[PDB]
Design an enzyme around this catalytic site. Structure first.
Site, short mmCIF file in Angstrom:
data_model
loop_
_atom_site.label_atom_id
_atom_site.label_comp_id
_atom_site.label_asym_id
_atom_site.label_seq_id
_atom_site.Cartn_x
_atom_site.Cartn_y
_atom_site.Cartn_z
N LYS A 187 -2.58 -1.97 -3.19
CA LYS A 187 -3.67 -1.17 -2.66
C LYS A 187 -3.27 0.30 -2.81
O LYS A 187 -2.98 0.99 -1.83
CB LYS A 187 -3.90 -1.54 -1.19
N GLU B 278 0.78 -1.24 0.00
CA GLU B 278 0.00 0.00 0.00
C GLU B 278 0.81 1.30 0.00
O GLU B 278 0.93 1.97 1.02
CB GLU B 278 -0.95 -0.01 1.21
#
Lengths: 303, 299
Positions: free
Chosen positions: A197, A161
């Site tokens: 992500k 992420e």
């Protein structure tokens, strides 16, 4: 750094999480967070309270296993039990949802720490290092990549992420990302057994989607099976329009464009619960609505 | 401070795609003065200027239906200024027979100006060739990159277990480009073929690599054949196009030996075998247009 086998498992999971326009649910809200959340509808940030609202979620109809591919958990939750003494950890393993563990600059001891989770019912992790320079970028990145390369050693699919919290956003997102994936290619990560992500480059969802894809398709390889966006602040309707838009954007997109939402899937459900275990059905509906709604944005058929 | 303006990109992309548009590929008419000779040597010819020019005149003047298997033809400096036996200019002969013309820039020094020349002469895309090595060449190809695009051209990123290597090199190369703020969409990639095996494998390994490193913004990947017999360069490109991996980019060919070997051997210098040469070339031209679309049946 792996054997055909280990990869097979990692890839099998990564894909199995986004398989059919399915997305990811955030059941990892920190102890304080959950309180700021439950606070909005005046319920105490107590272990039970959390265990309850969550018991609701994971007890929805086994048809939920169509809009959700996996649910990330906060340590505590991952060891909480439903009114029957059954582990929230096996309730999901049943339906067909994969359990995740929010691991979070914690590189040290996050090996045997993982190997634990994997054997407890978790298959993928989630690490986050915020971004909004040269020494940071390369660091968070080489950091990510380091983290990631371990999970592989411990049969865990790692969702990377590299978020860029709030077009100028594009340039940044692209650079950061370009570092991030470079970083990973150095530590010899197994992209195929990965996930991403990234933030959603934030303008009409069309544009918001345009810029976003251009960036990703300019940096994220075609080996990554999925790109579950985080919604971070977008209203339940915007997180859906944008994911939808993103899926209709006319750019090449060799990868499943999904969602890894928390606020965008709970906001309504949580507000419908308000602590009254008497509104169990109402909650499960506001959640079933968002779950399905975004399953459509993931296949770009939402409207 | 972006290297290009919306327009400049439009042009770069329009060309990059227009070169591989429909299973079309790229032709190597850039053989060095020495090279060409070694070639002409097999057929046993003298490395004259004329000799070269004719052979080429033969190729460049092939049935105007060649412009369905070739989107672009790269050229050697000298050639870009030669004239067919009718005083006409290959520069135009090829530009008329619907085929984008490419120029070999093979040397980083004062290239810009040098390009700006070619662009305005009829060229629109060009060519050019341990952790340390990689980084240098990486950042090198990135310069050759940015410059070309300043001058309307299109940089043909040509980067040099072979998998592991290919992936790393590439991963550096595209990183490099993302730094100098290149316009990937207005680029192209001439990677060698990830090879040492069945075109089934030779293609597998190869795609996995590229799809693991080359972004989806690069419109095409015209492999080089460097060494593969005309049939293998076709099987492999074909195979590569049938490989079950994602491939967000046109997988083409940027061949020289794989398109001439037969044609050149059929010419042997006798301007009397013009038709024979043009056939062996028409065969390879079409043959690989199919591999580009993985529609190549190999009797």
């Amino acid at each position: 750094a792996l054997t055909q086998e280990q990869k097979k498992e990692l890839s099998e999971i990564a894909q199995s999480i986004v398989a059919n326009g399915k997305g990811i649910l955030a059941a990892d809200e920190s102890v304080g967070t959950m309180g700021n959340r439950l606070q909005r509808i005046k319920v105490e940030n107590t272990e039970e309270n959390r265990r309850q609202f969550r018991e609701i979620l994971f007890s929805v109809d086994s048809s939920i296993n169509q809009s959700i591919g996996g649910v990330i958990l906060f340590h505590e939750t991952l060891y909480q039990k439903d009114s029957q003494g059954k582990l929230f950890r096996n309730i999901l393993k049943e339906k067909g949802i994969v359990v995740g563990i929010k691991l979070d600059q914690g590189l040290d001891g996050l090996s045997e720490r993982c190997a634990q989770y994997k054997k407890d019912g978790v298959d993928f992790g989630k690490w986050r290092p915020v971004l909004r320079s040269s020494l940071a970028i390369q660091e968070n990145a080489n950091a990510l990549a380091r983290y990631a390369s371990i999970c592989q050693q411990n049969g865990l699919v790692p969702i990377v992420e590299p978020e860029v919290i709030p077009e100028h956003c594009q340039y940044v997102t692209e650079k950061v990302l370009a570092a991030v994936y470079k970083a990973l290619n150095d530590h010899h990560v197994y992209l195929e057994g990965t996930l991403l992500k990234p933030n959603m480059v934030t303008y009409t969802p069309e544009q918001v989607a345009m810029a976003t894809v251009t960036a990703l398709h300019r940096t994220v390889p075609a080996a990554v099976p999925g790109i579950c966006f985080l919604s971070g602040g977008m209203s339940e309707e915007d997180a859906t329009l944008n994911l939808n838009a993103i899926n209709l954007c006319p750019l090449p997109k060799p990868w499943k464009l999904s969602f890894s939402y928390g606020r965008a899937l709970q906001a309504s459900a949580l507000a419908a619960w308000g602590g009254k275990a008497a509104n169990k059905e109402a909650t499960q509906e506001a959640f079933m609505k968002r779950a399905m709604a975004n399953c459509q944005a993931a296949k770009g058929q939402y409207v």
